[PDB]
Design a protein around this ligand. Structure first.
Ligand code: HEM
Ligand code: HEM
Ligand SMILES: N[C@@H](CCCNO)C(=O)O
Ligand SMILES: N[C@@H](CCCNO)C(=O)O
Lengths: 215, 216
């Protein structure tokens, strides 16, 4: 990932935090020169077996995901192939009218974590079922409303052969936290103040991140 | 892009709508087998010609973007290389507690447009300036607050040598509007109603889209 030094996450924990809150990654692998790369939006969790919860240095962590086995990307996934998992969080257009300085150019403040690693296809039906059950239970606790999957386990069994589950062993993780760090602190405060005052929670979320970087 | 039939864009204009609302794309090209694909988040606008010759499904449309020339992806951009531009819109986790049906499985409702096309690297200084000027002007008009760039054009000319601008000639565009179309109407309504009462704009936005998809 290409990241200007002043936009890197100040601490590794920022990356795990963004992934945890936005775990529907874009999973990308190389394709042919004619077709271009493959890309699928799919849910990622850390391996409950080993990594368990989200660490602050992601190197060597084991992640898990799943896709549709009919997805052509599944057939191109091979054990040993490299994969990119791109996670995105809050973002907002920055109008130079907020700056109070001239001259200027507009920009877009945004957040992204690019995780790269090596794929291992999961072939066991039960191991595959464990992955999706771990994804379900994890997300429901974090984002849901106390839903009990007990009465659905037979349903999970029935549809699970269509699940293409896989493991990713992380080789690198990079965060892009473009949050106006290139601007003077007074300028950053005006942008942050403008964002925190809008009824859009995405703008609010961007302002919160902006106020977290050191002065 | 792999899209189950019931999640395809309800109408081609939905792809234009999502791109225009969320124009910071992830621009992706193949890389080495050791490195994996290149990916850069960058702003995309339609070529000004395209609005006056609009193709139904975006096929043949021309799009414009730019990145840092110091970005290693710029050296891999070659005229004629295929590229993927991924745009994402509103999304929200769907808990089966909203369904009121058993059995069920959780899912994530989300929106995405994947645009594939052929790159043309722009090298001319004036054409590069035209790209960033039109991006700034478009985005400011759509998202900004009446900022006038006239006092900053000299500034644009100073820094435009670092811009790597490019054109993409679209070869296909596909939408993924995963908005509970697989559920019965009574189920979709419960999710919409719960999402619209969240007060988070991302959830309310997802609910509004959900309600605008006709029954499949
Ligand atoms: C916890 C949240 C879950 C989310 C967010 C989720 C999300 C997704 C997504 C985005 C896809 C599309 C992949 C592609 O485009 O190739 C997919 C496919 C699939 N997932 Fe999950 N999944 C979850 C849990 C589960 C569970 C518990 C099962 C139980 C077996 C399951 C079974 C499947 C199956 C069978 C497919 C392929 C066919 C279909 O989409 O119905 N998923 N899932
Ligand atoms: C709303 C308008 C704009 C947005 C959202 C935007 C966004 C971006 C982004 C995301 C990058 C980094 C690309 C990468 O990672 O490789 C970039 C690079 C760059 N852009 Fe823009 N841009 C805008 C307008 C402009 C304008 C009007 C100029 C004037 C020449 C300009 C000049 C540059 C330059 C010189 C770079 C590379 C070095 C640097 O970041 O200073 N941009 N832009
Ligand atoms: N870094 C330059 C260009 C930003 C607009 N395009 O990124 C500025 O902040 O003025
Ligand atoms: N189509 C199945 C699987 C959804 C979980 N994976 O997305 C359902 O909606 O129950």
């Amino acid at each position: 990932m290409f990241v200007p030094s002043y936009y890197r996450e100040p601490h590794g924990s920022w990356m795990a935090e963004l992934i945890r809150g936005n775990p529907l990654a874009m999973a990308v692998i190389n394709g042919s020169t004619d077709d271009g790369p493959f890309a699928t939006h799919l849910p990622i969790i850390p391996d409950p077996r080993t990594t368990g919860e989200w660490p602050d240095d992601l190197t060597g962590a084991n992640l898990l995901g799943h896709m549709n086995r009919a997805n052509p990307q599944w057939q191109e996934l091979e054990t040993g192939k490299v994969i990119l998992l791109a996670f995105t969080g809050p973002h907002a257009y920055v109008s130079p009218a907020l700056y109070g300085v001239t001259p200027a150019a507009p920009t877009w403040n945004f957040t992204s974590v690019h995780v790269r690693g090596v794929v291992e296809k999961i072939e066991s039906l039960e191991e595959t079922l464990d992955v999706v059950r771990a994804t379900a239970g994890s997300f429901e606790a974090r984002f849901g409303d106390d839903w009990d999957p007990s009465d659905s386990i037979d349903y999970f069994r029935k549809i699970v052969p269509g699940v293409g589950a896989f493991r990713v062993t992380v080789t690198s993780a990079h965060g892009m936290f473009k949050l106006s760090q290139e601007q003077p602190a007074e300028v950053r405060d005006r942008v942050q103040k403008s964002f925190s005052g809008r009824g859009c929670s995405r703008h609010r979320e961007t302002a919160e991140l902006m106020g977290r970087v050191p002065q």
